[PDB]
Design a protein around this ligand. Sequence first.
Ligand SMILES: [Mg+2]
Lengths: 572, 33, 54, 1230, 89
Amino acid sequence: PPDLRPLVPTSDLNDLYRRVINRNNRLKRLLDLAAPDIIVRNEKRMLQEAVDALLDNGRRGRAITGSNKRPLKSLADMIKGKQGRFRQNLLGKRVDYSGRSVITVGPYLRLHQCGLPKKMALELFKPFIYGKLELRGLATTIKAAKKMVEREEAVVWDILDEVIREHPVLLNRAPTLHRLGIQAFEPVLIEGKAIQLHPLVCAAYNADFDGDQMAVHVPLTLEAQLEARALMMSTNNILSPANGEPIIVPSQDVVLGLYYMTRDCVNAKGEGMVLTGPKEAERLYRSGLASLHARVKVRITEYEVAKTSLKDTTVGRAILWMIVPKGLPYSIVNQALGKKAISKMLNTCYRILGLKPTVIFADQIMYTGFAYAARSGASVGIDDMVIPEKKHEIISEAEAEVAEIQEQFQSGLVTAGERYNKVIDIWAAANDRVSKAMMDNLQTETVINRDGQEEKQVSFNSIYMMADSGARGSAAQIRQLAGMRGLMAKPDGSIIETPITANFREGLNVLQYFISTHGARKGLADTALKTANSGYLTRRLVDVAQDLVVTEDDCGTHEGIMMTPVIEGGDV
Amino acid sequence: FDAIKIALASPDMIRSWSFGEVKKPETINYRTF
Amino acid sequence: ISAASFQETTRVLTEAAVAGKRDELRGLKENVIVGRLIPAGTGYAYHQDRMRRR
Amino acid sequence: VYSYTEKKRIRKDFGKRPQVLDVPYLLSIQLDSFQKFIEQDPEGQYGLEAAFRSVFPIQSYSGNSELQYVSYRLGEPVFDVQECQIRGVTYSAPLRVKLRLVIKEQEVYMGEIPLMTDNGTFVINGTERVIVSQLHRSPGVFFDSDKGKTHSSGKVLYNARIIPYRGSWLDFEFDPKDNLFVRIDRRRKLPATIILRALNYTTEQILDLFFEKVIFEIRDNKLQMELVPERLRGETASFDIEANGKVYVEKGRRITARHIRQLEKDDVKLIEVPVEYIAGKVVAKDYIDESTGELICAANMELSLDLLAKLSQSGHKRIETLFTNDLDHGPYISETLRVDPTNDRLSALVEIYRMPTREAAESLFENLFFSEDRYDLSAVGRMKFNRSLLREEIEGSGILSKDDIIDVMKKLIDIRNGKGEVDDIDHLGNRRIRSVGEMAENQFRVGLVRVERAVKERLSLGDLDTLMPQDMINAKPISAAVKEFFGSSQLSQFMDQNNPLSEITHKRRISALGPGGLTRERAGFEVRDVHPTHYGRVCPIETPEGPNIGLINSLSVYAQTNEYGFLETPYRKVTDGVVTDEIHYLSAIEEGNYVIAQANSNLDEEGHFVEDLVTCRSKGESSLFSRDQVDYMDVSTQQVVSVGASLIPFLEHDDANRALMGANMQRQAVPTLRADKPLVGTGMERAVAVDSGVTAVAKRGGVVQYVDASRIVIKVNEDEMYAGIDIYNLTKYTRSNQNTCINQMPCVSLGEPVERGDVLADGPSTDLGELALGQNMRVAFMPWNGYNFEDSILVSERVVQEDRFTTIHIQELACVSREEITADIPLSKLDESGIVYIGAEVTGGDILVGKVTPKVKDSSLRVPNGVSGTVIDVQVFTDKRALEIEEMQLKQAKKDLSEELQILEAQYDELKHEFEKKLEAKRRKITQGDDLAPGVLKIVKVYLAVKRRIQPGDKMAGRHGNKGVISKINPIEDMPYDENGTPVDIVLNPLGVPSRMNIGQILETHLGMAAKGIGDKINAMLKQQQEVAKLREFIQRAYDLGADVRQKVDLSTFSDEEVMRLAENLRKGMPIATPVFDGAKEAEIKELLKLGDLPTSGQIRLYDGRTGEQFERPVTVGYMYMLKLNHLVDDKMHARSTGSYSLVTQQPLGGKAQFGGQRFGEMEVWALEAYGAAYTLQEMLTVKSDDVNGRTKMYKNIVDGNHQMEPGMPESFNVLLKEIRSLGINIELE
Amino acid sequence: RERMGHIELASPTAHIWFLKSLPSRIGLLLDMPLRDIERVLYFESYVVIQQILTEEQYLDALEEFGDEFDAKMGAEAIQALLKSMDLEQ
RNA sequence: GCCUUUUUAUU
DNA sequence: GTATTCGCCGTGAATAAAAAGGGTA
DNA sequence: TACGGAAAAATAACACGGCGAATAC
Ligand SMILES: [Mg+2]
């Protein structure tokens, strides 16, 4: 049809259709004047090639190209591939009542809420404004209701907050390589044209606040709004579909505010005093007479029915007891509460307490882990971590250890392959020796006199608080930070013989930073290219498994497979 | 609809879809739209 | 319909035209492209009543 | 010893090792590559003369007429640089060539080339777009290999690639069947016999050139073989070799290397050999009988007992055959002779024709490689052709000769047996640079051969009665071939010019995309990674990650493009262990042979190394060498970084994972309306502004007479003049390519003398010669009650108040009037002419330019919502608004020429009259008809600007890569505040340093805290009004810290009024330069903290904003350099409820200009159906887009108050239903 | 947007989707591979209405077996061969 | 009222 | 008849912005 | 006011499985 290939003030298909009808009209001009056999076999071949170029391109004797060197789009080129109807116009249909902007943190709002802008949600809910105007009787038409929106007077926003008071709104990342890329929210009207995506579901989106611009969607009808509240809401999306661990994991900052509280320090302000309950520790800390971490004895009331015992609990862990629900035990709270530790704390609250005390608990973790992170002051600086004194002696020993290995190769003691495996052997052993020497200078370095003997306790360095918790830094990432980063890989796959002797605190060398980029730019070229393969793997995995739907409750078959865990490794 | 059947296009089925026959290779007029 | 969206639209549409292959409206990629209720949500209950109608 | 523009804002360098070589011209790969393209040089190596002497003389086939060429000339362009940026005319001077008609000369103009400005870019269609260089495959012999599991199947593969500058690719690939196959243009592979038989070679001439020949002799026994001393290496035989009763090789045992040297002293040319050892070999030689002349044996056949018995009746004693081996000489060439169907010469050319007459097949192979028009190799294409084959000379013919094909086959057996090494495509010697003047030489030669074929057809019908050269060559294909390359092409990239760093890095951008290079989405994995040979030439930092990483990579600071095209960087030659002052440019081939030491080494006053074992590299990998064994040394500490990566401070302290993300965002910073210098920067920061063309650089030095923001005049001194004075028209608030403001503010006062190298007016995002991409805010690396869950930024209200990050975005609203200019619709922003005047505060959704159609319906354009602001200027060119610019430019010409003549007055009638005729010459070039698009009478362009205010949503980051947006407008009372009272301006997440090694943003923050604290004490000494001499001692003491600074400035050379004006620029803070690898240590910043009133520790205790309590852990405050990016939330927010739909399918549109319909995508359908949202997914693709009968019934249902969805037939599937029904495939619905 | 059009061609045309597919729908019906089923379509060879004969074998076929068999080229001979063969046979 | 290429840029 | 290599063919993420170009005399 | 398509282009030339076709044994 002509609306399927419309002219515009020249297309890539109607000019291809001119190649076919010109060949069709010339064959009608050959039959009436009795054309010879030589000229009709050549004209029928170009007529056959015109239909071969119209219905397809790329499968012929030669693919037809346009005047501007680009390959011309045939009827097959607009039905297959990314530019076909099946991917661009049947699976990738553009969506009205739906916007797109960058995402923000938004710590004051709840888990089921987010932040929609004023002029953005007014443009997304534009017929929803017109429905409420004709319902009350302010503008009982469609022409003057458009004038009320574009004038932006005071009565438009009071109508708007009634519509968006409990309306579900789908927040959607533009790459969704996971199930949790589309989550619903109940937004409130804010200033600023950015959406306030919740930090608890920020790990569920697998997308940090690095300036990523992503979509947003709304359901119009009431049967689609209940799909967003019962299935797509962020409240009932606690557990991941992949594993039993919850996808709502505190990643960087709220876990950092939890880790500064749950700590033990000697010679603190208010050490060894009694407290009436967990709520008195908020009175104990906000007045400022006692520290956030001090070994005291607070009274707590544990449930499953209420039991009471006076156990050793610091001031920061006593803030957590007003945050947890009743039936949550204390034995999961008494640890240091790192990111790997509070992944089971959110899982045990989902297990025995239920989902209804989980949303309030997860929101009050984010309220406490953010507000006390301001009072924490956990930062990064050149005075926080320190190059250990054993590092300068290990590097001087390792540079002296490669001197006798190189002199053995000149005399002819070892071969080329035996020397290459020996330099990596004595450097990775030196990389592990400098890893433990840097670790003890961050674990048991700074001491405070607790009115007596100098006891060995856990250091309060902010780099180790982000390392032991497993929040954003691992055991190998702080190894590259304060100590040497170790052996770097070549682009083909081999290892550099001489690794970086220095570290990032005093700066690398020119060649040391150059061989550091041999694994960093390689890993970033690995990252930017495997997302084209895993994105193709995402399409290959769904398109074969989209037919499989659960359809029966019970069948009656006893057939199955035998389950055995991983045993071939050394440790389970 | 409950099902979609795909088969070969008959010469009578192609003319059944079309309401008219086109004879001109040029799309529109050059002077006016 | 679910096979033509994946790849080989020039091939698998020729495999289905010469063989019939009248699909019975089952699958999720088909119901997305033909634009109706998904049989893997609350539309499965619509598909459960649709088998009760037919 | 310092310049005049450096005395106002002198900046301390923290480099321990001094730079013995100053920074060269940053546009040397762009200007000097194109400067040789313009001038008429007598040589034909580099420039446009290489394109003219290769095509001309044009000799027709039997036409007896020749077209001779003598010279070419470029005249002045019809417009200047400033007129083409607003009009749309291509900045291109008419190029006129003198052509001689011999069996009559005229300087005939054929086409126009886009001329290069002082910035280094071209103006094609009113936009600043420059072609960029190419990291493509160098023309020559490339030995490749794919080991492991890529096309191996249990065997190693060796493919040899001979690629030209242009023509047909020639490949020699192996197989698991161990047979050399030749590949031309990646087609069906042919055997290696017919590619050698096409060079007039017989069958016997192939084997002796690629193998060794052994001599045989017949005696009373069966046969004897002459022993060759170069054949026993790796020879395992079951029989024993004897020589005159002496046993050398044991039977059935692998011999060691002792028998090789023992046999060399007793060389015997005859041994005894059994009859079964020779039958396994090939004969490789034809023989003709003497009796009847019949062929005894065929060509390349295996011997047997019957074939060896025919040698006695033939009568020849010498048998010339080969020697087979598995490690010395590979027999894979001899096995290919049984694979090919034919062995003749005439029957092999028709196989290339199928790759079928005799004349067409012979002329095809001669035009494939032997001809110079199709196949061509330049001096660089023959350099790699001779270096990879280890030839004697480097110069040679462009064609592949008869002896050049057999020489690459000898090297292919050497790399197969292990005698020669295999090359790699990631080597910088194997990556030629198609520069600006090199690609303009070829694309003009594309038009030069399109008109060569035009005159080969026109001269046949010409009467030759002294014909004019005007109608011989046509102006259409010569001009369009240059406009297709400089316009819509892969190399003509859209140059983003919001900040001058992106203007310089786009000139030094090496993009492998193009017709000669590989594309981005289909590239292999090995080309994306960085090779160890990238030391000094191409940086590994500046790569735009995403769809194209590794192909596009910036060129370094000191890297230069050779006349061949290979990349070199200057090294300091070390003679007898002592480095010298002179430099030596060495390529990537000479880098592997030479032992080049590293720049980061402590040197004495003489030039010796203080260590016995210094760090070094030879092939790129890290190693250790002595101070005497090294040959060269790096000339500076900015070798491996580019001009965009060098501006990032503490790059040794910064991670390579994050600096790759850091400099990509630095090339898209928007110019702030107030330019505040970087408190922590590099010595390169003074060099980017003086090398960029958007910053006003004075051509001649001297004092100034009238300093205005519109134009600055400079009184030229007596030595700088040749007279008069020069003028510099500053581009104030013009539109750039990315809809961003460009304005040139002056930096000098009245009566300020400047030199030649000084800056008289800073450009956009620049102040006093220092590039100011952003503003130094008080960054506190701490979370505050949320807002820092990730690396986003919490900003102050003070930043919103003092306009510290608000930028200006000047958008273009063009009006195509095919359509009267009158605004008679069936307002206050118009001057009764249909055109908006200058300075109207428009709002999104009103009429801007009235355009009605003759019928009367209104179909004009309007301003979209969200870009409401004032108009800079409305450029009307081809009615009352059109003559306003025509009188404004007349008064601008009456202000430019009248100021020019009045200086030389203080005979006279002739010097005044010559400027009057130049005024009318400038008048005629303005009021003339501008070249526009056909079909319209005039086009009006509206430079509509909008003050982009900082708000939650604007992407802001540092130079290190702290990627994030603004959390909220946090007020000034809520931010944390130090003991002196000043609150912080940026509250930032400190949890990036656990993720990546981003401590360099804290070394910048700690140095920025020290530089602001010194600048606070200078501001304290200026508010108290202390003595000028006591103010000098504080600056002299401040510039003396460090181990050994390379500046070593003296404040006694500065005057008393000079140091008083110095403290005015030092009031906001102390400008401090730190190198990327020769930077300040951890102890030098703590020593700098002892100078100020703040303590030595990097973190200091301070109270909370909303709480008022002192933190138990001190946070690291400081003036870290932050910059606002180009991704703003005013442009990256698009919302659509209902709007115009597409015409192909009934679906919404893309882009904010097309009302912003959000595309769902195939990846988000599966995330929507995962939860079981059947009612939502059915809405998301039918009611939103497909159901045209449904979306109007839905729009009548939502306004009714009923949220009810009806099931309908999707028209987007009806789009798909007609596509299959348009083919010969039946499809229907049941 | 729903109404379509058709053209009446003077010669029949073979479908390119069913030809260049793997396996060929036209090639499996005429029990020929891909190489010879496109030589008769682009008028380089002739088939009878089977065996494949080139253009130089057509001048001798009309004077030897011209009255027994008739041969054509293009998709008209392909359509006449598909009209000659039967599905059940 | 658009569509398709190419380039830049983002996740 | 049974492999076996190869010519050609399927695929090579997702999403926002700008530019020309939309047949040649 | 006409034909739309051919041969030259002094074209652009990728990589990892796959399906069927034309050979060697
Ligand atoms: Mg991100």
